[PDB]
Design a protein around this ligand. Structure first.
Ligand code: HEM
Ligand code: HEM
Ligand code: HEM
Ligand code: HEM
Lengths: 136, 142, 142, 136
């Protein structure tokens, strides 16, 4: 993928202003409730579950890694891809669904500051990360 | 297909956001056109197609009016949206792949405007409802 | 949703390929597992999961039996496949994104075996039918 | 994307054995009939239309270009992408649909020779080409 500088700046800004411990748990919870079949990967209410929260937080720290290597994303997630794929058996479609929930939760937090332009750079970033995770 | 729980969740949500329907329509269409460039081609006959544009503001009201109609015909969307389907398929020839894109923009819009109301429980029923609308609109395509 | 023209096209096609249902099921499941690796996980309890495998051969018959059932309940798939839906959603917990993948493999299989019968006119009605089956099976997921 | 040598060999074999003038017209016709909304890009029966045939043939010659540059696909289609996108206004989803019809038509011609392995390499090749065409 190719990134403009305006894109690079928006994504970077979005992440420094984001509170991972709050966005993380809300996005995963919402995904488990709106797309119920993803709940199976966590069989061991949903909004208050600490295990779901911990993984919600880990997703944001993982996306953070991608923000610091925007020009080498595919390589940055090889480990995570094999892990979710080969050892956890997470369907690749589940990444697309979780991606939309992060967008919707971030949208609810930023309000009017989540302009169309901001939505665009954020969705393109998640799209690239989703391709890398649903590859290996 | 929508259960009684889903129908009441949508009627309930709609009684809260219905008053802002025009604003939601305007912002959703603007986002769709900016974020998904392949959609501009259908509105290129308008002289101005930017977030502020009165043409977008104007069409934004018609689209959310489509939603309001769907909400009242929620027991049978297929029948309730038949004409809107014929219109998009044969007269406007809108590629059907875009219905889900606009739905997602509407969800984003509703989330920026009513963060408190758009809970995950409301989100799932509205999402099921909007998929129903997309399915109903694709009906006359083939 | 399926029109009278679609229902007769499917009954017509099915009267031609129905006799080879077992073979189609076997080859479709094999392809799906090879081409879409994310599907193997659901059949990993079987000792042998390769094209030849008797477990695959055996399950291939059950799946096409699901199709045969759907063909006979073509007037109401939602109702006709309700139990198969409950089963895949709660007991087997099959991710719903895979229904379209298997449908596509079945179409490929039918095309390699009956190139003469699978015309574009037959293809569109069968495709609409298989989407109906996928929609019916996803019914109890949320 | 990464290609094994077995993949490189299959795709290459598939194409040299393919008769473009026969596969081309059948795949586009089938797409216009199964997914009717794609017919609009050709408003100026369907199976016997020479204009549809000519473009059907051009699609195969275009994919052929990709076969000869399997390690530089994105760059090989930049021109075609901008053309179908910016000047022809073809929805990116239409490439996915046409792609499935090429597969189904090729499947009907090769019969039992279109093994699961062959289907796999062919679909991965079309997938990469589709990403490049639905990008610019
Ligand atoms: C949006 C991209 C995602 C990222 C960046 C991500 C990241 C991570 C990370 C960093 C770990 C910890 C790895 C380790 O301990 O070695 C992990 C674990 C895991 N992930 Fe994900 N993940 C993502 C999406 C998903 C999805 C969609 C599911 C299924 C709903 C899922 C299910 C799991 C499970 C079951 C574990 C192990 C338990 C745990 O550590 O809490 N992940 N993930
Ligand atoms: C949320 C689903 C949608 C609903 C409820 C909806 C509703 C409507 C309504 C009520 C009209 C006015 C009918 C008339 O012309 O008298 C209309 C027109 C139109 N719609 Fe949609 N629509 C939807 C999605 C889409 C999408 C996704 C596109 C294309 C990106 C689209 C493109 C158009 C165009 C081009 C017109 C004619 C514009 C004009 O007034 O010149 N619609 N729609
Ligand atoms: C063409 C749509 C499908 C139909 C009509 C269908 C039909 C069936 C039927 C009739 C059964 C046997 C019920 C029983 O266990 O007594 C079954 C079981 C099962 N299905 Fe499906 N199915 C479909 C798609 C899928 C998909 C896409 C997957 C996952 C990749 C899947 C995975 C399973 C599994 C794991 C079982 C239990 C296997 C076993 O016997 O141990 N099915 N299905
Ligand atoms: C699968 C990938 C595709 C390839 C490799 C491809 C290739 C081409 C090529 C080589 C041209 C001629 C360009 C020129 O004269 O400068 C062309 C033209 C065109 N394509 Fe495509 N195309 C593809 C898919 C599609 C799809 C899905 C549609 C819409 C159904 C479409 C619609 C058109 C139209 C309307 C023209 C111009 C008329 C013509 O030259 O016959 N193409 N394409």
């Amino acid at each position: 993928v190719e990134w403009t500088d305006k894109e690079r700046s928006i994504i970077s800004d979005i992440f420094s202003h984001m509170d991972y411990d709050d966005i993380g748990p809300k996005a995963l919870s919402r995904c488990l409730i709106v797309y119920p079949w993803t709940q199976r990967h966590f069989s061991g209410a949903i909004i208050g579950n600490a295990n779901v929260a911990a993984h919600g937080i880990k997703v944001l720290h993982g996306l953070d890694r991608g923000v610091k290597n925007m020009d080498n994303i595919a390589a940055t997630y090889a480990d995570l891809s094999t892990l979710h794929s080969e050892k956890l058996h997470v369907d690749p479609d589940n990444f697309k669904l979780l991606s939309d929930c992060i967008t919707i939760v971030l949208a609810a937090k930023m309000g009017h500051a989540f302009t169309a332009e901001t939505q665009g750079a954020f969705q393109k970033f998640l799209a690239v990360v989703v391709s890398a995770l649903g590859k290996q | 297909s929508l259960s009684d729980k889903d129908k009441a969740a949508v009627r309930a949500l709609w009684s809260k956001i219905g008053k802002s329907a025009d604003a939601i329509g305007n912002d959703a269409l603007s986002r769709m056109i900016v974020v998904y460039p392949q959609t501009k081609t259908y509105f290129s006959h308008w002289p101005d197609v930017t977030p502020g544009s009165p043409h977008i503001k104007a069409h934004g009201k018609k689209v959310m009016g489509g939603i309001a109609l769907a909400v009242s015909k929620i027991d049978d969307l297929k029948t309730g949206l038949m004409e809107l389907s014929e219109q998009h398929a044969y007269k406007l020839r809108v590629d059907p792949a875009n219905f889900k894109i606009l739905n997602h923009c509407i969800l984003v819009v509703i989330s920026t405007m009513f963060p408190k109301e758009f809970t995950p429980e409301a989100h799932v029923s509205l999402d099921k409802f909007l998929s129903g609308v997309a399915l109903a609109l694709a009906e006359r395509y083939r």
